[PDB]
Subunit: 237 residues, 6 copies
């Protein structure tokens, strides 16, 4: 057991999907996983383990922010033998052509956090996902009839940033989505020799304000989970 | 309502206690508050509002990490008229004389996060608590027969830091406890003109390893809540 | 003796009040101290030792700037057994509400200097004063019927800064006064294990642009001194 | 024409392969391109344009260092309509498993330079290659039965660094190869909206200390070129 | 008059020699200048104006540290028509071959202060002296038969630096002397359009720990003054 | 031989003139040196050795950028006995009074590169040239009747800087010319124990956008060469 995970080696699959909303852990378990079992409840961060088409998979939230997800991803890697971590969440878009409900795959992740500089002797560490996982997610999406967008995400420490102009810089450099974990998870993965990938659906615009019915979300959300799960099966091949 | 708080102005008291463990919100509500009511459940972050000796008070978790707590504290201040925020949690000690179960009041808060530099034009912003709140907590503790320790806390972005030596620097500079929110909350308070204070009980040593029975914790925890709540009443005077 | 202080262990009291102007030290000693004697003259940085209501007390200028006061405070602590240092000076206001002749107690101090970053491994070190000393100062003020504002000061390296935009930043984040020593003195207090406090009187308002020099301004300066001196008496008890 | 390129819009193909050694460009053009003609000679930075299996292709050295390649890639993109840039060079390994003659595809690139910080408001910009170009390169390698490692490269500013400790840091975080251009080229691609990729062959192992120069090493260099050229053909389809 | 100087235009010469210690300014005036007249006493920072071989000259202390010297140099340049500032202070030696009483001309000045970074958008500003003034000092020394090393000085913010290893870095890069003003004075000269030069007398050796001993605190301190004064005459010619 | 130079000790003179463009190195050799002999061709970075008025002299390109020039200067200093490096390149003017064809002597060199910060523990290293070499150039110019400004140069990493406003900062602080090597060369000279000086010919004006036009690309470029060569002779004397 670890400080934030009351479980033992083997309780988690070697692949773990992690939503930002804690409530989504249970939802994913009862909707996509078979024969699921609870493996953690520490601090209310419910963790589950089951199988998807025979493949063992676990699901558990990571909390909002690099600090929070750095804890869970780290403990899972070093103490529970986790090899892959797929973050499934939302993101705000700064580009005009990126619309709500669009699926973005963060091959890379910029950030204004200092965690990676702390790790890389104050130099620039390119926080990146595992290449194979990226391609697995892209193909999985294609197979479902979805055209995902692959590029850079921006992991912000402040949802309410005082530097509004930074969003302009993000757009100017091709940032596809703004979230709050990617860079941190990728940093942890590199630090402890694991693999990671972040998949997000555009929840809103950081310049205007589009609209998406309640159904659209729940539907696109299921689509994102399917992409993640099927990407794992492609990876196993 | 806000992105992370599904409530309206008035649903929260002007004073809010915020634990790091989400589960503690409900516990505090049913143990110390009277006539409590649920005011939020978004993303599973239960929020409650009641009265303590006639004084209106709300309680709700803030999540682990500066990013997470910066969201909640901000939304509460700007959209729900909150004037005071008291964080109640745990902390790791680096000083030999600071023992487990000790109560530490963070008058100041150092950090390795970049949020404050982002706010202060890359200069040094002294993340501090409201002075009156600090003295209210100190006196409240005294009245309960508890000698609190007042000084600097260190808000770390990484629970599992690669820079072990930094803990040596912390000890050399009088850091009383290492946690993961203070500096961020104090930053938000200064940014939006509110008042904040962080109170923590030593959960462990970052050099050795003492011991505290399960009872000791639950007991000292109740003590910390009492200190916080009574400090509010002293502030009202 | 030291390179900057030509005196011997014992000449100084364990409590030293330090104004920026060395001629101000002479003023303080002759005005408030009984049986005072000059204990230092090096570089014209006058130092004195006498008694206030029977208590042994010393006063000595610290020169302008963090680099200057860092030397004198350090030497007083490591070579003259000084346990407490109270800076009594002036500052410029940036807050509309902060008026001329207002007494400000710097519980914390922000800064443009990099001295604390050098000390704190390039991270954010919250330069704060000793809690008890702040409490004694506030209680002393109250006793004298003098209102006192407790908060953050800003220790600038350049009295004539090339970027006036920082002033709006200070105002936005609640800085009570701009001086040039507090942050440095607190760094030294932490590094060498001593206690320090900074008290200042608003001599000018950078906002409406206005200085203060008259019987009223000189009356307020004396009040600050009285606050400092009486605060140590309360501390002794 | 430009200050560094004495040619006209149309002389270069929309895809340019760029080695660090200008003499290497001559080698590539004569070895793989048909009906190739020199399109630039300024500063001895030879440039050529020809066809590979009917496809118009150009090759031109980029000089050593981020500052050098930043100029040429920028000009090619903004003044010569170049849409894709493929860097084909060498790198030094730090990972025990990465062997000599191994082909490394830099999906991302870390760095000691501050060029991207200047571009990204002093925050962390993840310098990454174009996903499709990386995918085409990997598929091309596969077709040639050539194994290829996809990951992070490290673009150093100093071939002779004063701090060898950074090498252990690179190894700990999985850097596949150390070169001196990738991070800069990716920054330029992002700033000016173009697509770029860096491919390299391990010419030396900084670990066991060993270079590679022979028929086998030259065979591997040609494979990298073949990979690059064939990757563009796949992209066209 | 200015904030820190009670005088009027014309009270100072167009060239001002400035030692860190006000008492040394007084010594210089009484020893080298004829018709010496005190022009300032604010904060005890003595300033004098007189003649040397018919040439009007001023000498005034600047206090310890960059923040202090920046004030006086600025005011002199913008309100008193000062064209040349020649600092005549002391310094600590780091190089083995540099001994006490040695004269050093700082054509350049390194520093760990943030003032120049504040002025130069966080980039590296090479704080250098006026070339003509440098040559004048060299020639002056030659004529007087006094040895003088021309090179880089280090302007430290902390006389009692917590980073001892930095001295090794200074030595490796040939820093001739360690003081606390050069880089700042040069920053002001460039910002406010004036010329400056720093000349120092090795006061002590940082390695051997040998301070200014013997009656060699005069003649040597005088050599520096002689050179500075004679350098001015050469410049006038 | 070295990694980037195919030659042996003795193949180069103890003094090497270095232009950024290899072709200009070739021009210098054939135009100013007798018995010119090509000593290197690796990567096309032409190097030559011959005699000028009886004095053995070498000239070799260093490529564009700090990373490039650092390599060649380093290798020459540690493996070929080079004692003096005199860069003879071009530069862009920011000051209104500086016109094309103007000669500039960089006694100092500012920069936005991180190389010196890497060498100097993130502090400010004043990248300066060798004083004697500077004076030799001034005197040489005087004798030849060629005007020359002695001052600060700016070594930029990005020829196509995204920060246009920085040019205004350069101008305000009197930067004579903008190039891409000075600060780096000086960093190497100090690190590896050698002497260097950078002389540049205003190639274009950053404001007016006037490039090197007319047949004035020779005689002027020659003045620079004449000064550099004659400065060496003076130094030998
Ligand atoms: C403006 C902004 N910044 C950061 N994250 C944002 C955002 N707008 C939306 N998000 C998304 C992604 C986060 O992970 C999530 C936080 O609730 O919402
Ligand atoms: C080593 C370390 N770092 C940061 N926080 C620590 C810690 N040891 C204990 N804590 C405490 C305070 C945090 O808020 C909490 C996280 O679960 O545990
Ligand atoms: C407006 C302002 N800025 C910086 N320092 C100030 C100030 N007003 C007063 N001071 C204080 C601190 C210094 O020690 C001194 C400088 O005049 O007075
Ligand atoms: C070990 C090492 N370090 C830095 N750059 C290296 C390298 N091995 C190869 N390179 C590459 C990138 C440059 O363009 C060039 C320098 O020799 O080769
Ligand atoms: C060892 C050392 N470090 C820093 N500054 C030093 C020094 N020795 C002498 N000085 C100089 C510069 C200051 O202005 C002055 C303070 O005593 O002496
Ligand atoms: C305008 C400008 N900016 C940066 N470097 C410049 C320049 N004009 C000329 N140069 C110089 C220095 C480089 O080594 C070379 C590149 O063309 O010319």
């Amino acid at each position: 057991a670890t400080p934030h995970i009351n479980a033992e080696m083997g309780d988690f699959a070697d692949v773990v999907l992690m939503p930002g909303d804690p409530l989504r852990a249970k939802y994913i378990a009862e909707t996509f996983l078979e024969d699921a079992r609870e493996v953690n409840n520490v601090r209310g961060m419910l963790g589950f383990t089951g199988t998807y088409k025979g493949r063992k998979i676990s699901v558990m939230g990571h909390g909002v922010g690099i600090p929070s997800c750095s804890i869970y991803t780290k403990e899972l890697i070093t103490d529970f033998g986790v090899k892959k971590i797929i973050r499934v969440g939302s993101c705000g878009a700064v580009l005009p052509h990126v619309k709500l409900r669009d699926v973005v795959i963060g091959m890379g992740a910029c950030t204004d956090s200092k965690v990676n500089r702390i790790r890389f002797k104050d130099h620039d560490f390119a926080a990146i996902a595992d290449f194979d996982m990226v391609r697995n997610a892209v193909d999985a999406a294609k197979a479902l009839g979805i055209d995902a967008r692959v590029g850079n995400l921006f992991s912000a420490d402040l949802f309410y940033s005082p530097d509004g102009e930074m969003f302009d810089v993000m757009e100017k450099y091709g940032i596809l989505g703004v979230e709050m974990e990617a860079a941190g998870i990728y940093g942890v993965a590199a630090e402890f020799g694991a693999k990671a990938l972040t998949i997000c659906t555009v929840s809103d615009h950081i310049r205007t304000h589009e609209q998406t019915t309640a159904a659209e979300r729940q539907t696109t959300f299921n689509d994102m989970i399917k992409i993640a799960l099927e990407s794992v099966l492609l990876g196993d091949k």
